[PDB]
Each structure stands twice: as C-alpha cells, then as structure tokens.
Amino acid sequence: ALPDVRDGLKPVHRRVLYAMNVLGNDWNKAYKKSARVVGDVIGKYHPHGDSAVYDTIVRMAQPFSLRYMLVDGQGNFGSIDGDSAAAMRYTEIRLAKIAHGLMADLEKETVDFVDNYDGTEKIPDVMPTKIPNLLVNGSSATNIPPHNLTEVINGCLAYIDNEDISIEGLMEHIPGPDFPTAAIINGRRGIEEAYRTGRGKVYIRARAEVEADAKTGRETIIVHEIPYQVNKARLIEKIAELVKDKRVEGISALRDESDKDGMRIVIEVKRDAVGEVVLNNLYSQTQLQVSFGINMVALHHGQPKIMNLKDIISAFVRHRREVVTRRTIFELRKARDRAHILEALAIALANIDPIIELIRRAPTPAEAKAALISRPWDLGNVAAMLERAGDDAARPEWLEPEFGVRDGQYYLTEQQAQAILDLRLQKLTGLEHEKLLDEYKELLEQIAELLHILGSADRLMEVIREEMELIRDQFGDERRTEITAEL
Amino acid sequence: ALPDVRDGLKPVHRRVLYAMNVLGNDWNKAYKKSARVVGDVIGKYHPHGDSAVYDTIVRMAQPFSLRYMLVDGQGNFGSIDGDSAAAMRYTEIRLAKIAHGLMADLEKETVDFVDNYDGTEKIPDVMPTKIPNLLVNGSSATNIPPHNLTEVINGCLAYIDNEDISIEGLMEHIPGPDFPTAAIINGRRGIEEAYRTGRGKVYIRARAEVEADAKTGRETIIVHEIPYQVNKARLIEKIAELVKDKRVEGISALRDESDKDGMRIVIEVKRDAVGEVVLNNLYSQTQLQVSFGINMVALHHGQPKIMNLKDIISAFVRHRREVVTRRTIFELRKARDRAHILEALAIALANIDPIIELIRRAPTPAEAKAALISRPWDLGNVAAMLERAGDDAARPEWLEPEFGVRDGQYYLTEQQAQAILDLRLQKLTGLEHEKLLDEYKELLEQIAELLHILGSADRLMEVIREEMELIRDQFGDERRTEITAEL
C-alpha cells in the first residue's frame, strides 16, 4: 500500500503495465479492449473477480488524475464531475509513450523478477524506469503531489553534477508542485518545509476572476480552474447549499457552463453586493481553496521511510546507476555470445570446400558435427580479423581456453559446429557473406564501449546524463500551476 | 442460449473449450489454474466480470452432471449434496481426453470461424466433433437427457447402413436415456413418444430395496442410486421434514452412510409398519421419483427446431460428411505443396555441385534466385521418382503447365528456388538425404488416397465408419440406467 521510491508504483500498477507490455499493447499500435488486459491480469497475476484491476487502469488514463498519463485511453473513462468509466468491454487502451520509458530495458536483466501466484509466470519487482515517476505523478499513509517533469529532470542533473547540493539548490530547479488541474499555490513557506523535512502544508486556490458587464455594471465570478482532487459537481452542489441556507450572501445565480473546450463555472453577483467580497467568502467556505498536507513516505528497499526532496532524487539516480550497469553486463554477454557464433561462420565460409566435403561424407548430421570439432581449421583470409594482436575481449567468459584461435588454427565447440550445420545456402552469396563479417566488426567496437562503461564511473554518469536530457526533450512540458509569492 | 445440434454446445461452452485448446491445456499436460483459463475467456471471448465462465467450467467437470465429462478437474468442484466448488484460484483443470475428439481437425479448415466481440480474434462457429455430444451429454427452452455413447454410435452406424431406418429400428440400438447417476426409468411409453415427436415425459425412480434382518425381523430400506439432478442432502432433509410433520409414517431412523464405495441411504422401518408401503409412500412424496420432460429443441441451420431422434442423428452424420470432405480438401492441397517443394530439393541435392557454385558467384540472394529459375536442371539419378508421379496429380492446382519436367529437364518456380536457398547444410548428409526421398513416396500414396475419398461417396462413408468405431472403442462404456416396463 506504499509505493516504491524508485519507480513510484505498487504491485497492482506493475501487473497492469507489465501485462500490457507482454501483450505488445504499444503506444504506436492499435488500441485493445480494456477487458483483454483485465483478463490477462486476472489469469496471471490477480486471480480474483474484483474490480481493482480496471479501477487501476482507469485512474492511469485520466488526465485530471495523472500529471503524465501512463495509459492512453479511448472512450468514457469518467470525469471531473465524478461520472464513472464505462464497463471494460466498452473502453480501449494502450500504453502511453512515457510508459515505455518506465519499462525501458526490462528484457536485459536490469531488475529482479518474482513468481506469480502459481509459479508459472514472472513479474518485475520494480521497473527499470528512466522517468522519475514518484515525484512527477505523485502518490495519494503518504501524500506526495505531482511535479513538472522538466523541472525534476533539471534537479536530477543538478544533483548528478554536485552530490553536495542543498535543498535550496534543488528548489532553484524545482520551485514546488505542478498539478494536472493547474490553479494556484498561495505561498512558498509550506513547500520549503516539505522539501526539507518531508512534511509541510500548502494552500491550493482556484483561478477565478470578477467580471463586470460594460453597460449594466453587473458583476460575475467566472471559475476557470479548481484545486487538485476536487469534484466540480459536488463543489457546485455545496455552493448552492450555502446560498439556500443563507450562509453565503450576494449570489443571484449559479451554473456550470463547462464543455470539452474548458471549465467555466458562472456565479452571478447581486447588485447590492461586491464580487470580491463574495469570492473571498467562497474561498473561506468551499473547496475553491483547500489545504494539501504533503507527507512524503515511500518504500526504500522494503522499509517505509519519510523522505525529503534530496533523498528522493538521490534514490532515483542510484536506481539509474544499478539499471545501466546491469544492462551493460547483459549486453556484453549477449554481444560475446553472438561474436563467438560469427567466428564459426566466418571460418566455415573461408574453408567452404572442405566443410561441404566433410558434411556430404557424413551419414548423419550428429557425426558431421563430431567430425567438425575433432579437427582444427585454417584461419585463411579471415586471420586478420581474429588475431588482432592477442585481443581476446570478444571471447565469452565461459569458453574454455582449449577452444577458439590457437596455434594459428581454430577449434570449434559443438554449438559452433551446430551453427555451421544450421547455415542456409543464401549465406554463400557475396553480400550476405560480407554482412556477417560487418556485424562482427561492429560487435568488437560495441564490446569495447561496454567495457569502458563498466570500468569508468565518469562514463557511466555520462550515459545517464544523456538519457536524462533525452527524456526532458521527449516528454517535458510547461508548468500549469502558478506559485505566488503572497498569502 | 440454444445448443447447436451438431456439437451439442452453446456459445459459452464453445468459447471455454476453444480457449483451453489455444492454451495447450491438454489431457496429457500439466494442470492449469482455473483462473488462468477464466481470464483468457473473459479477455478474448466473453468480456464480463462474471461467474458465468467459471460456472460453465465447473459443470463440465462434474461426473454427476455430465455423462462424459469434457473437463478434467483437480480439487473441490462440488458434490451431489449441492455444496459449492472452491474459488477459481484454488482449482485446476485441463481438457478431458474425449474433449480432444470434440475439437479434432480444427486446424484443417473444417468449420467456419466468426469474429469475437471486438473483431481481433477468430472463434469457431461449431466444433468439428467426432463425438455425438448433444445426445450423449444432453442439455437441460430445451431439455435433452444424456445417452450411452456405445448405443448412440451404434445408432449412427445403423443410419449409415440405411438412411430409411425407422424410429423403432433406431431404438433397437438406443433403448432410451442413460443418466450418469444411474437409477431406473419407469415405463417405455414416454421414451418412444419423445424419440418419435421430440416431446415426451419419463419418470426417473431411485434404486431402493427392502431388506429384513434374519435374527431380529427388522426391515431396512436401502437407497443405492437416486434420480438425475436430485440433491441428496435436500432429499434427506425433506424425508426428515415429512416424518416430523407426520405426513409419512413408519420411519424410526434416517442416516446417510455414503462413502467412497458408493451411495447408501438407510431408512429403518418401525416393526408396526410394512417396508414396501413406506417405500411406495416415499416415491410419491419425495424426489426418490421425479418426472423428466423431454423437449428436444436445438439450433439447426441457424433456426430453432423441435427434432426427433432420427433428425438429430441425421444432422450429426451430415456434419461428419462435411467435416471430412473439407478436411480431405485441406490435406490434399497441403500434400501437393509439400510434394512440389520436395521435388525441387531432390533435384538440387542431385546437382549439388553446380548449385553451390551458382550461389557462390551470385552477389545477392535475389540474383541467385533469378539464376536458378532461368536455367533448366538435369533429372539425374532422381528421374525414376518423378516419373512414378507420372500422373500430374501431385501437382498443385495453381501451377502453370510450363513448370516441371520438360524434355528431360526440370524448370523451377520462384518458391522452389527459395526452398533451395533456405536449405541448411545438414541436409547434405546421407540420412537426411534419404529421409526426404521416402517422404515423397509416402506423399504420393497419401495424395491418391485423398483423391479417392473425394471421388467416391462410398469411400467417404468408410472413413466416417472407422472414426465412429474408434470413438466407441476409446470412450464407450456400460449402461448405468435400467429401463423397465412400468409400475
């Protein structure tokens, strides 16, 4: 019931997003019915007939709930007035583009997986996220508000450049929360306290203007934006209640003129009243102004912990160091496995005449294989490629020293012999031959760059910086919530 | 909500069995959790957070509900006392062996597929069943009772020997229903009325006997079997309710002694009472005897129809005629396309030396392909095998006449060239050489047998007969319900 500080998620979130990932439910592919995803989650991860899965999908798709939606939804997903989402057989979803950054390099042994309820499926323990999702989308015991992604990436970059940065140094890049529903924060004092201690109170206030008709002089209050997590219809019901009960005076009419092009609550003022006095009374009596108690609590390796702003940014960058290191180990083993195979193929294609002759002479493929490994092979015109002044970095770690280039010859493994046996005749054409050799030369350059990253903390942080700036370019947007230096 | 006359299934039944088929949830593989199958069905075919899917699975697995269970279930799936099955996260299922006979040859274009609820999946309109499942398992508006498989197969075979067979002739093989709970049917009048018109009333009566002690002289009523669809616990509660309200007399004790060795209900008779009178009293006031209204309605050519016994059997045999015809068409086209490829491979392995040189000097696979087709190839040592197929029958129905053998030379198509280019080196061995030669002979034998089936209605019915006798050998069992004159 508490989110992980590294990806900002709970198990139920991770089941939905992983299930969508394994189904190929990608941001640039056709929508699927919500019920398709719900059924995969029930069958594999949450085997109950409840509605919790669909409710999780629905919030993840609501622009009035998430500052950066993780689900791209199509259909009736509810409203700011409290309307319900349609049933799961009527709505359509797919991953949001930013959710792909949440699950980047999940296939590269970057995070631990755990077993599902029956031991036939795996599920990630945490996401390998490039997106600081805890700060950016928030969590609502814990009460972390959402933030602007550009500001947070810049704060992360500032921390990477100076681990001894202070809270005040981070607030030069992160002045405070940024809600999907915009509006106004009155005052900075509660923000500084919450970023310094993990706890503080801020005041959120609606964006509202007092108009006056050009001829008649009559005043109207127009409400453009309301505080985060406030239901518009309930708010208007309450104002009407106060007007009927005479607890708020000066109001002659009230109605919601909102449409799909913006919010517009109309509050008409009596002639004998003052629009600003009415508005100030509404702020004091209604959810046109609310307090938001910031309480930044999250799981730090399984343990609940109160965390200040620096703690949270520090944990996300530490997460990135681990994810990139593990990714680089995985790509290094995968590159060496493939280079190993390509050496066997290059050698077969340089000795093609005795290779074919050997195989034709064999009764069964199982003893053509045994003949290939019993005999060394000349390096031929590919010895420039394989010797390389004693360079043996492309060798798999598990390869015994009796295999590979030796004494000017090559000694195959059984799976290398199998690879040769699996070769299709197309591979003997000229362009396909060179294509295998070009892949091998790229792999040697790739392998050297992977070893550099593993051996230089400076280079690892260079890679992380680049990822951060790219995320800023793709998903950064403009601040919505105004922070005043008043009240 | 009507069953199809051909496979005995409603849409929800068919969706469950198709989903388990697609999952590989086979009779000879490990059990899967019920929830995993339920989730697949909800997502793809039946998108409601509902118990309809799991209730369907549960009934299919109950030996007291189905005369030949379609689901092999492990765990608590309920009992004849009416207690509920455990939740889907606690039970395990796989297809029963007979269920694979329901779905045999689904992949050979034997039945029409229709769209699912969202048009992203295909689902069969009906199953290509070798089992006459409507009669044999029944459906309880319609109300069809179950039947013995051995008897129904024999009736189908008698209809194949004489389509002019009468109801009375079919009843030499099928004397009446056969319930999984055994017991006794009283009177043959309603059976014949139902088999001739589609509607009739039969009376199901428990198997009960009065025994008397040798040393004490006491009488005990022992119930061994009870009517189909009667809850044993409700029945015992009713007998007790009648004894307390004095509506039945002569009972001094009542005790359910049922175990793993069978059902056993004990009713001790008072010495002032006569056992036979009390038992008769029970048959008249309890579910120790019930009526069963046979009302054989099913979907036939997409319309509801009342159907007598000959109508049903004729519809099944007609279904088998269409499925085998369509299967034979599919298998014949598949066999001609494999024979087409095999010819090309056989000529290449014979002229292997100029093939390797031709490909080595091509710079790209496309130019090796244009070089393979444009010149003819010598028939070599393989020319005897192609002439055995002197009948231009193994030839696909799309092939133009200029391709093939011509003046001692073979002229390859584009597909045939690709198959050569896709050839792996291990095919150049000896045992993998001849393996492909034998396969070509067997294909010619098989192609002839398929052509005979399509040409001769008599031979088509010979395949169906063998299939039916196989089903009888594999799954036929003994009759459980005794049929008596009347009482």
Side-chain angles (χ1 to χ4, degrees), chain A residues 279-426:
Chain A
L279 185 50
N280 282 353
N281 285 316
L282 287 177
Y283 283 139
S284 323
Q285 292 272 310
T286 67
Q287 300 197 300
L288 280 180
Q289 187 178 269
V290 305
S291 54
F292 186 104
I294 297 167
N295 178 41
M296 298 204 305
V297 189
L299 296 187
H300 196 242
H301 305 285
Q303 177 87 277
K305 199 196 149 202
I306 293 176
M307 272 160 117
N308 69 48
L309 178 56
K310 186 170 177 167
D311 296 332
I312 299 179
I313 287 153
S314 193
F316 172 67
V317 168
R318 194 64 213 60
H319 184 57
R320 290 313 299 155
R321 280 187 196 105
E322 180 64 5
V323 166
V324 171
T325 302
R326 286 181 63 165
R327 189 183 66 201
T328 302
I329 281 159
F330 174 89
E331 281 165 345
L332 178 62
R333 180 177 91 231
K334 175 185 168 204
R336 280 168 169 169
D337 281 338
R338 176 64 179 165
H340 176 69
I341 294 286
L342 287 173
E343 290 178 0
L345 300 191
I347 284 200
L349 282 142
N351 304 45
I352 195 55
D353 281 295
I355 292 279
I356 288 178
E357 141 176 45
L358 181 150
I359 301 157
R360 288 184 68 177
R361 276 201 192 120
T364 88
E367 66 194 32
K369 179 165 155 154
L372 285 161
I373 76 175
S374 77
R375 181 224 278 209
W377 300 86
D378 298 348
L379 309 200
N381 49 277
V382 86
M385 210 188 56
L386 286 132
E387 259 157 356
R388 289 178 266 115
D391 191 325
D392 64 329
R395 287 178 47 105
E397 304 212 308
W398 46 260
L399 186 65
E400 306 276 56
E402 48 261 19
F403 299 114
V405 181
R406 276 174 53 225
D407 299 13
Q409 321 217 263
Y410 204 111
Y411 300 60
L412 304 172
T413 62
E414 260 183 2
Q415 322 93 55
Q416 283 183 302
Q418 190 64 69
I420 288 163
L421 289 181
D422 290 345
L423 202 56
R424 305 172 178 292
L425 289 184
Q426 340 188 16

Side-chain angles (χ1 to χ4, degrees), chain B residues 53-118:
Chain B
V53 176
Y54 185 49
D55 293 343
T56 300
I57 291 168
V58 161
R59 194 191 188 256
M60 277 173 167
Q62 281 165 344
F64 51 86
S65 301
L66 258 73
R67 183 70 182 72
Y68 303 89
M69 296 90 54
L70 302 179
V71 166
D72 174 2
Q74 186 178 255
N76 177 14
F77 276 88
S79 80
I80 204 182
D81 287 340
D83 49 311
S84 298
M88 62 187 183
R89 77 187 176 274
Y90 296 130
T91 54
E92 298 110 53
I93 61 180
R94 63 187 167 198
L95 285 172
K97 203 157 168 284
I98 197 167
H100 290 288
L102 266 176
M103 312 194 263
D105 311 306
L106 245 184
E107 77 280 27
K108 303 191 180 212
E109 300 179 358
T110 53
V111 291
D112 295 342
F113 287 70
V114 296
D115 296 314
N116 72 328
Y117 70 94
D118 68 18

Side-chain angles (χ1 to χ4, degrees), chain B residues 3-4 28 176 218 241 342 363 375 381 452 476:
Chain B
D4 194 301
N28 60 359
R218 292 322 289 298
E241 187 205 284
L342 274 176
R375 54 163 289 188
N381 86 299
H452 188 220

Side-chain angles (χ1 to χ4, degrees), chain A residues 115-399:
Chain A
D115 279 349
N116 71 335
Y117 65 102
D118 63 21
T120 63
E121 302 283 352
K122 61 175 176 154
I123 170 78
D125 187 64
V126 66
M127 287 315 191
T129 178
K130 304 180 161 174
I131 289 133
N133 181 56
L134 177 66
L135 279 181
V136 122
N137 267 322
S139 208
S140 87
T142 182
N143 207 39
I144 305 167
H147 291 73
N148 177 280
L149 173 71
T150 301
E151 298 180 359
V152 166
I153 294 287
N154 291 343
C156 289
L157 287 170
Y159 169 83
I160 279 157
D161 275 6
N162 176 11
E163 67 171 332
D164 297 321
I165 192 152
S166 55
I167 296 306
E168 181 193 54
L170 290 173
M171 296 184 63
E172 286 184 53
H173 310 279
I174 300 156
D178 183 37
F179 299 107
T181 49
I184 303 164
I185 298 167
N186 260 3
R188 318 184 175 265
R189 270 195 343 248
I191 293 165
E192 195 274 327
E193 187 184 5
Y195 289 168
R196 188 181 90 246
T197 68
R199 290 198 164 121
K201 181 215 274 181
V202 314
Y203 292 110
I204 313 171
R205 172 176 278 218
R207 181 174 293 296
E209 278 174 2
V210 182
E211 295 183 350
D213 185 276
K215 308 190 80 78
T216 74
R218 286 300 283 280
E219 288 174 297
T220 308
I221 301 166
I222 302 301
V223 186
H224 299 277
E225 307 164 359
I226 59 169
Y228 185 53
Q229 297 175 314
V230 172
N231 180 320
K232 176 156 53 67
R234 291 314 109 53
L235 167 65
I236 285 165
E237 259 162 57
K238 176 60 168 189
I239 292 165
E241 225 150 75
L242 291 175
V243 160
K244 175 149 74 34
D245 284 343
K246 268 93 186 181
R247 315 262 312 296
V248 166
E249 308 197 304
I251 287 164
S252 67
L254 174 63
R255 62 169 170 295
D256 189 354
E257 298 196 353
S258 299
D259 50 44
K260 29 170 287 295
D261 310 347
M263 165 195 295
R264 189 188 158 78
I265 309 165
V266 172
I267 311 181
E268 277 165 12
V269 183
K270 292 171 176 172
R271 257 199 274 227
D272 51 323
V274 194
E276 282 85 342
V277 173
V278 180
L279 185 50
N280 282 353
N281 285 316
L282 287 177
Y283 283 139
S284 323
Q285 292 272 310
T286 67
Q287 300 197 300
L288 280 180
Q289 187 178 269
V290 305
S291 54
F292 186 104
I294 297 167
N295 178 41
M296 298 204 305
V297 189
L299 296 187
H300 196 242
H301 305 285
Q303 177 87 277
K305 199 196 149 202
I306 293 176
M307 272 160 117
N308 69 48
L309 178 56
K310 186 170 177 167
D311 296 332
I312 299 179
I313 287 153
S314 193
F316 172 67
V317 168
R318 194 64 213 60
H319 184 57
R320 290 313 299 155
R321 280 187 196 105
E322 180 64 5
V323 166
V324 171
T325 302
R326 286 181 63 165
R327 189 183 66 201
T328 302
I329 281 159
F330 174 89
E331 281 165 345
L332 178 62
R333 180 177 91 231
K334 175 185 168 204
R336 280 168 169 169
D337 281 338
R338 176 64 179 165
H340 176 69
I341 294 286
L342 287 173
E343 290 178 0
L345 300 191
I347 284 200
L349 282 142
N351 304 45
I352 195 55
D353 281 295
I355 292 279
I356 288 178
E357 141 176 45
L358 181 150
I359 301 157
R360 288 184 68 177
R361 276 201 192 120
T364 88
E367 66 194 32
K369 179 165 155 154
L372 285 161
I373 76 175
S374 77
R375 181 224 278 209
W377 300 86
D378 298 348
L379 309 200
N381 49 277
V382 86
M385 210 188 56
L386 286 132
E387 259 157 356
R388 289 178 266 115
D391 191 325
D392 64 329
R395 287 178 47 105
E397 304 212 308
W398 46 260
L399 186 65

